Design a protein around this ligand. Structure first.
Ligand SMILES: [Mg+2]
Ligand SMILES: [Mg+2]
Ligand SMILES: [Mg+2]
Ligand SMILES: [Mg+2]
Ligand SMILES: [Mg+2]
Ligand SMILES: [Mg+2]
Ligand SMILES: [Mg+2]
Ligand SMILES: [Mg+2]
Ligand SMILES: [Mg+2]
Ligand SMILES: [Mg+2]
Ligand SMILES: [Mg+2]
Ligand SMILES: [Mg+2]
Ligand SMILES: [Mg+2]
Ligand SMILES: [Mg+2]
Ligand SMILES: [Mg+2]
Ligand SMILES: [Mg+2]
Ligand SMILES: [Mg+2]
Ligand SMILES: [Mg+2]
Ligand SMILES: [Mg+2]
Ligand SMILES: [Mg+2]
Ligand SMILES: [Mg+2]
Ligand SMILES: [Mg+2]
Ligand SMILES: [Mg+2]
Ligand SMILES: [Mg+2]
Ligand SMILES: [Mg+2]
Ligand SMILES: [Mg+2]
Ligand SMILES: [Mg+2]
Ligand SMILES: [Mg+2]
Ligand SMILES: [Mg+2]
Ligand SMILES: [Mg+2]
Ligand SMILES: [Mg+2]
Ligand SMILES: [Mg+2]
Ligand SMILES: [Mg+2]
Ligand SMILES: [Mg+2]
Ligand SMILES: [Mg+2]
Ligand SMILES: [Mg+2]
Ligand SMILES: [Mg+2]
Ligand SMILES: [Mg+2]
Ligand SMILES: [Mg+2]
Lengths: 177, 260, 67, 60, 144
RNA sequence: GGAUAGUGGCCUACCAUGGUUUCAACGGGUAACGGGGAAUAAGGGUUCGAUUCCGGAGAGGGAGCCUGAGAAACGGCUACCACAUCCAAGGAAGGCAGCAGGCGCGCAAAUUACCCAAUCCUAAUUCAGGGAGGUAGUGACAAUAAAUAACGAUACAGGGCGGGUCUUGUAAUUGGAAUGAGUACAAUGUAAAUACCUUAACGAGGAACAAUUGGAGGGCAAGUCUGGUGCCAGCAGCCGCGGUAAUUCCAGCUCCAAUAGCGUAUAUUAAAGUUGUUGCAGUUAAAAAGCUCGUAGUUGAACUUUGGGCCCGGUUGGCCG
RNA sequence: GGACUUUUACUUUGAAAAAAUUAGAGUGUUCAAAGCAGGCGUAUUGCUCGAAUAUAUUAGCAUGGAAUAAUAGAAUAGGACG
RNA sequence: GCCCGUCGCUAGUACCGAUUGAAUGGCUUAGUGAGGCCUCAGGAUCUGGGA
């Protein structure tokens, strides 16, 4: 009777499970952008392989086939609108080539670091969670925002966060009492 | 299976009613009436979903029981009444009137119309034959029988309906070059006015249509609804007059209205 | 905090078109209660097993004080 | 072949290992904090290059 | 052409010839004949709980020489009798014959595993509790 | 002709001898309801669909029927079979493959709770009714997001270019910061509650708010560390380990993998070009009938208006804009 | 309207075409799985975009093509046009 | 060196086998036949030929 609540998975999994070449490599990415799960990496490989064998499929169509452009130009719009594809690259032969790290450097937990304002890449992840920084009045506690380079302009802290103008905060207030 | 089904699950509901899946389990099963079940729309969705006058279903019943609503003239208090294409819904409060007319996306659109226009009607005649005592009658897409029409009305033609009373006065004909309205398939919504009609004795005569953008298409004759003369209709078409904007056409103009 | 509300062209129109669980939220209609739904269902069934008044079977149950 | 060999020695050596107790350690960090330390531990001060490097050298 | 008919109209021959020749695949006949249910004392199920009749100790196959501690079990859904290994150091002391035990395959598609000659099942739980959770003294065996 | 709502061997009477089949009839099997669909990602495929939607069938097993617009209805009746309850022994009553709950079966699956507020449905009908349906509880089925920490100062030390002033940081005293897990005025939420969202008051330093699960000879990532055992006990999907210095067992230590999850069993798909149409193999590894005929099936040489001419206007892109 | 038409296979395009599923556009659910919303002012009594597209493919229908592969035609002329 | 078969031990599997062996389901002859339905009667009554 119920209508079926749709779901899906967000992470693939390496077939060879112990390729230490790719396993060190995986961790360098992990301990760089501040990730907890190697499946935060496996996750963002997944969409990439989707974008690719979405995109790779379009360059088979006869050049400028009706739908190849509609969702072609729909695709490259989506990725510059988050700023992973750079503005030179909006004719979609180069979207096949989005090496993974581009996606990670466009996180929230990442740019909150590259804007200064994160002493470490992990001071980032720790304050995002804790009622700290926002974009509008809209607090965000998801270190995987994928900020869209438009709203990257306003990433100052929140008004209720006692690091960007607030009341003292919970344990300060009786360190002083 | 032991007689009449009287329930309608969701996702059995007609898509063009645009109900969200999770609001329960069921759509409102339209009642029996003028319009085919799958080819109609009930009052409770009109007053609740597309037009958002009422919040819940319980309210829609409260609304109708005050004789507020009229369709084609009459009080018509059936919460699930099968109101269909080309009906008129006068609304006593607000002095609003709506003719029921498709988009070119094929759904039922909200379309306010004049008080003058709110008192005539058309119908694709679906049958014509003699009857009791030999008085001929026409019957049309909407479920009414007009006794004593002219011998010149054959079948497949539209008819003006006074609907303060019964009779017809004018009857547009089905010939090469009359304004048509596709009322099925999903060329549903597109418009205009002939190319020609392939006979195909045995069934399923094919109707060729040329929209007023020099774009052809074909649909079956059962689903072509002549509505008059080139560019000269006999009712008020809705916005964009059904000329099947492309996906890129539609989103090029989608971003044409770009600056606030 | 976004929401949704309505104002009425009178307060008799409010009290008559409004769901009555709201006039309880306000103090504008009284809370007065009913027995839990399952209890009265049973009374129905208990009542289905009687044909008529129910007055005139009291007659003959007090009439086996002899028998 | 034979299927009715003895059963006295069931659990013979687990019974008789001198069962040294566990020894208390500091509390290790978790998914980000921990895999951070490996990024450092693996990649910021190389263990050794005397030949090539070992991730668990006991006596070397 | 060395073999198979290539004409555009030989589809039936191609289909029946595969249909027929697929019978040489052992996974394919095992699934079609149905040996899972007819043979294979588990009901084709993932596990089956039984009752232990005797505690045996089985001479290991060569070139090994041990005594593998196992139990003869009578599958309670089937009446079938099956010998099954009790793995870990000890874990014979937990089984307490006439006890109720839960049995699993060996991850060898039947085809008994190791040096233990002809046993294709292992205990997972005696007295319905979590055998390893008794080896590691997480839990206690119930009263009976 | 009869019967049907009506067609019809549906049934009857008469007459005839037809109907299907290797292009697989007929029979058997099915751990078989069909489908929309699900799983598996080069493709071609392979496997699965009791199960939210559509269709069908059934209400313990049959058959029969009343009512009716509609039923061969079972929360209708009647009979038989099986099951089975109450009794004053005369008799009477029961049909959960509805909701919940119980026994049984098993590897295997939750409350005898709340409401018509929503979604819809039915009635004589805005009102009544609705275990349809929705609410909570139970709930590592699956699915998403992602806490268990974050910045210092210092101190021996490295290394930048004697430690100086740039931190690599390894530090076993420190340090003021931050916060929800929890708790809880309150409002919100709700039919009434509950959670969540929001938010006073509380609420973190190792005694914690203390992450697991497997594994560390090979495949396969991580030690020929230490103690134990001595072909014993045990490990080991496979190759193989243990018979007294065990890289493999039982442990302590250290280490790796995944991580609110991870192991095991069973099935299944990929890998599998080991089912091969794409795409296999058949001298000797598995596999050309001893031989020829030969029906079905599959297959089957070539040659029939080609070539030339006039026109129309379409769609890219060029030089121009 | 009349008269009369050798039979096919193949390929094109198109109609007929349920939703949910899938592929996929739009939309910043705080993110995401989702959902089909939402977005704007004069936030004093309204303004407004939506709810795409794709997908069926075996069979049937409709239509364009005449290569490829079949069937049939005048030989006891019982042929063809009148 | 390798290696074959009878013979003997332990264990497991499946086969053959007196028991005109057993069991579970699906049909089904013959025999008996419930019930409701259709129908020939019936006529407690209850009425204007009907019930
Ligand atoms: Mg209705
Ligand atoms: Mg009630
Ligand atoms: Mg009553
Ligand atoms: Mg063979
Ligand atoms: Mg034995
Ligand atoms: Mg059984
Ligand atoms: Mg006949
Ligand atoms: Mg015969
Ligand atoms: Mg065959
Ligand atoms: Mg079945
Ligand atoms: Mg496929
Ligand atoms: Mg396969
Ligand atoms: Mg199904
Ligand atoms: Mg199936
Ligand atoms: Mg079943
Ligand atoms: Mg029945
Ligand atoms: Mg029942
Ligand atoms: Mg029923
Ligand atoms: Mg008595
Ligand atoms: Mg139940
Ligand atoms: Mg379970
Ligand atoms: Mg319920
Ligand atoms: Mg329920
Ligand atoms: Mg914890
Ligand atoms: Mg602490
Ligand atoms: Mg461990
Ligand atoms: Mg290694
Ligand atoms: Mg070996
Ligand atoms: Mg060890
Ligand atoms: Mg795994
Ligand atoms: Mg091919
Ligand atoms: Mg081969
Ligand atoms: Mg040989
Ligand atoms: Mg030969
Ligand atoms: Mg032969
Ligand atoms: Mg040829
Ligand atoms: Mg098409
Ligand atoms: Mg006998
Ligand atoms: Mg009769």
């Amino acid at each position: 009777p119920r209508a079926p609540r749709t779901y899906s998975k967000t992470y693939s999994t390496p077939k060879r499970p112990y390729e230490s070449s790719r396993l060190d490599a995986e961790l360098k990415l992990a301990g760089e952008f501040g990730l907890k799960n190697k499946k935060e990496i496996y996750r963002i490989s997944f969409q990439l392989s989707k974008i690719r064998r979405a995109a790779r499929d379009l360059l088979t169509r006869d050049e400028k086939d009706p739908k190849r452009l509609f969702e072609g130009n729909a695709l490259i719009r989506r990725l510059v609108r988050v700023g992973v594809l750079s503005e030179d690259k909006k004719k979609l032969d180069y979207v096949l080539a989005l090496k993974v790290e581009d996606f990670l450097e466009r996180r929230l937990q990442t740019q909150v670091y590259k804007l200064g304002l994160a002493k470490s890449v992990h001071h980032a992840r720790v304050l995002i969670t804790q009622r700290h920084i926002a974009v509008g009045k809209q607090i965000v506690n998801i270190p995987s925002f994928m900020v869209r380079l438009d709203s990257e302009k306003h990433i100052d802290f929140a008004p209720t966060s006692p690091f960007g103008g607030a009341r003292p905060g919970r344990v300060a207030r009786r360190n002083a009492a | 299976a032991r007689g009449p089904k009287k329930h309608l699950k969701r996702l059995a509901a007609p898509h063009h009613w645009l109900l969200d899946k999770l609001s329960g389990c069921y759509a409102p099963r339209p009642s029996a009436g003028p319009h085919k079940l799958r080819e109609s729309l009930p009052l409770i969705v009109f007053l609740r979903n597309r037009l958002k006058y009422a919040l819940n279903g319980r309210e829609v019943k409260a609304i109708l029981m005050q004789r507020h609503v009229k369709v084609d003239g009459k009080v018509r208090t059936d919460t699930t009444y099968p109101a269909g294409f080309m009906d008129v819904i006068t609304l006593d409060a607000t002095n609003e009137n709506f003719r029921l007319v498709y988009d070119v996306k094929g759904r039922f659109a909200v379309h306010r119309i004049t008080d003058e226009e709110a008192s005539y009607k058309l119908g694709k005649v679906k049958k014509v034959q003699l009857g009791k005592k030999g008085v001929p009658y026409v019957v049309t897409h909407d479920g009414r029988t007009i006794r004593y029409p002219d011998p010149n009305i054959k079948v497949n033609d539209t008819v003006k309906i006074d609907l303060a009373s019964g009779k017809i006065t004018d009857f547009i004909k089905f010939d090469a070059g009359k304004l048509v309205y596709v009322t099925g398939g999903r060329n549903l919504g597109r418009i205009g006015t002939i190319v020609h009609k392939e006979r195909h004795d045995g069934g399923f005569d094919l109707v060729h249509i040329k929209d007023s953008l020099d774009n052809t298409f074909v649909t079956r004759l059962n689903n072509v609804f002549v509505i008059g003369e080139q560019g000269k209709p006999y009712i008020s078409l809705p916005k964009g007059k059904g000329i099947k904007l492309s996906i890129a056409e539609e989103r090029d103009r989608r971003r044409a209205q770009q600056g606030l | 905090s976004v929401g949704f509300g309505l104002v009425y062209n009178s307060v008799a129109e409010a009290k008559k078109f409004e769901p009555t669980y709201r006039l309880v939220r306000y103090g504008l209609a009284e809370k007065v209660e009913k027995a839990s739904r399952q209890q009265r269902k049973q009374k129905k069934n208990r009542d289905k097993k009687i044909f008529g008044t129910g007055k005139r079977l009291a007659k003959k149950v007090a009439r086996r004080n002899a028998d | 072949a034979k299927v009715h060999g003895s059963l006295a020695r069931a659990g013979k050596v687990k019974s008789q290992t001198p069962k040294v107790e566990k020894t208390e350690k500091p509390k290790k960090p978790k998914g980000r904090a921990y895999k951070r330390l490996l990024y450092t531990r693996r990649f910021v001060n190389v263990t050794l290059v005397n030949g090539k490097r070992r991730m668990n050298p006991g006596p070397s | 052409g060395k073999g198979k008919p290539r004409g555009l109209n030989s589809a039936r021959k191609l289909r029946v010839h595969r249909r027929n020749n697929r019978w040489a695949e052992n996974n394919y006949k095992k699934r079609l004949l149905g040996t899972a249910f007819k043979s294979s004392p588990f009901g084709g199920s993932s596990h089956a709980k039984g009752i232990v009749l005797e505690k045996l100790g089985i001479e290991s196959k060569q070139p090994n020489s041990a005594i593998r501690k196992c139990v003869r079990v009578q599958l309670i859904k089937n009446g079938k009798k099956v010998t099954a290994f009790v793995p870990n150091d000890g874990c014979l002391n937990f089984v307490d014959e006439n006890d109720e035990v839960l049995l699993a395959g060996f991850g060898r598609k039947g085809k008994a595993k190791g040096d233990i000659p002809g046993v294709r099942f292992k205990v997972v739980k005696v007295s319905g509790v979590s055998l390893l959770a008794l080896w590691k003294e997480k839990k206690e065996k119930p009263r009976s």
